[PDB]
């Protein structure tokens, strides 16, 4: 019977694989960044890698729906197909910092589900600069869900469970009232 | 064990099985009713069976926290251990009608999760004035947090178990989170 509108699934970590696990009805958003590609990273898979001038040009022409400066570099979510996908019932995964999560929760509250991935302790976070991570963590209370990341695989499972639950939310169903009126009509 | 175990009052409704399968960190609640015991049913297991006078006496002295008339008979949820169980991190399963669900959603919004279990069709419902009654109950599913179409009992049980697990990770249900983060991830 019932179709569901997509969710914009926003995941934030400080520590920074799990997303990989999660994707293996959701598509991965690829962000634009001004930072250099690191060993093993590939254009179009990890990020779209551009310079500061091009990043600003893309913002100026409407192609970036969110952006922030994160530890000295720009990062932004491309506008392309996002809202499209929500209408189609396709969810999108965004792995962004708290500034980005806050922006999504403010601008698209009804379609966003936010999850903060917490390290199990500071000592474990250090083993995985930390002042920045502590400040990021202090924004956890604004997120819909929080998960302590002991094991990556378990975290991925719990995120998958949250996504599946959120897809069954009544407020995300399309045409429920019409469905009830047609299939379970009150007579008289 | 950085975050503390969280307890939900899980309200399930259908048109007046799935419950049993879910239970076999949540405990059953046994309701009071004024209807007659049916074949196979046992006091203290299926319901506390009382007469109308005694039911109204239990409502006066505060021992019943919710009550409704459901198809000519009274039903109610005993107050005993519900609030204390939420404090212990222990979830409670309430299998109640829409009047009960609405009451819990208004009385204890922050602790309640409601799920409406829809039959797959009116014919399936009918083979399980009465249909007019069921359609009216069903009309209320728009006010529930979640709606699930019951195609397969076991699938429905797994989906409910998934929703329960997800809701237990909601940030708003962790108590003392801010103080936890301040102690374990201090900003310096
Ligand atoms: N606000 C925002 N943050 C992003 C975006 N893409 C990545 N990030 C965040 O930037 C931080 C640095 O990522 P890294 O440089 O380690 O890949 C991480 O928190 C990551 O989630 C984005 O499009 N917008
Ligand atoms: N409001 C309310 N409904 C209840 C309670 N206990 C059972 N019910 C509901 O009353 C209806 C009739 O239950 P039955 O008589 O078939 O066992 C069902 O929808 C059941 O969920 C209760 O404590 N409160």
Swiss-Prot record, chain B:
Q: Disulphide bridges in this chain? A: none
User: Is ATP-binding there in the keyword field?
Assistant: yes
In terms of PROSITE patterns, this protein maps to: GUANYLATE_KINASE_1, GUANYLATE_KINASE_2
Q: InterPro entries of this UniProt entry?
A: GK/Ca_channel_bsu, Guanylate_kin-like_dom, Guanylate_kinase, Guanylate_kinase_CS, P-loop_NTPase
Q: Cellular component GO terms, alphabetically? A: cytosol
Could you tell me the EC number(s) of this protein?
2.7.4.8
Keyword Nucleus set for record = no
What's the superkingdom here?
A: Bacteria
Note the NCBIfam families from the entry: guanyl_kin
Stated role: Essential for recycling GMP and indirectly, cGMP.
Q: What is this protein called?
A: Guanylate kinase
Organism expressing this protein natively: Anaplasma phagocytophilum (strain HZ)
Native organism taxonomy: Bacteria, Pseudomonadati, Pseudomonadota, Alphaproteobacteria, Rickettsiales
By which gene is this protein encoded?
A: gmk
């Amino acid at each position: 019977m019932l179709k569901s509108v997509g969710v914009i699934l926003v995941l934030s970590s400080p520590s920074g694989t799990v997303a990989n696990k999660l994707l293996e009805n959701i598509v991965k958003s690829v962000s634009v960044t001004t930072r250099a590609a690191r060993k093993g990273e590939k254009e179009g898979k990890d990020y779209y890698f551009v310079d500061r001038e091009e990043f600003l040009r893309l913002c100026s022409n409407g192609e970036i729906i969110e952006h922030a400066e994160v530890f000295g570099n720009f990062y932004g979510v491309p506008r392309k197909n996002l809202e499209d996908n929500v209408d189609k019932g396709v969810s999108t995964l965004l792995v962004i910092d708290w500034q980005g999560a806050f922006k999504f929760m403010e601008m698209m509250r009804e379609h966003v589900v936010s999850i903060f991935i917490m390290p199990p302790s500071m000592e474990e976070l250090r083993r995985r600069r930390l002042k920045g991570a502590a400040f990021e963590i202090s924004h956890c209370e604004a997120y819909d869900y929080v998960i302590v990341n002991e094991d990556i695989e378990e975290t991925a499972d719990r995120i998958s469970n949250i996504l599946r639950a959120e897809q069954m939310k009544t407020c995300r169903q399309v045409g429920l009232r019409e469905l009830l009126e047609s299939r379970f009509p009150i007579e008289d």
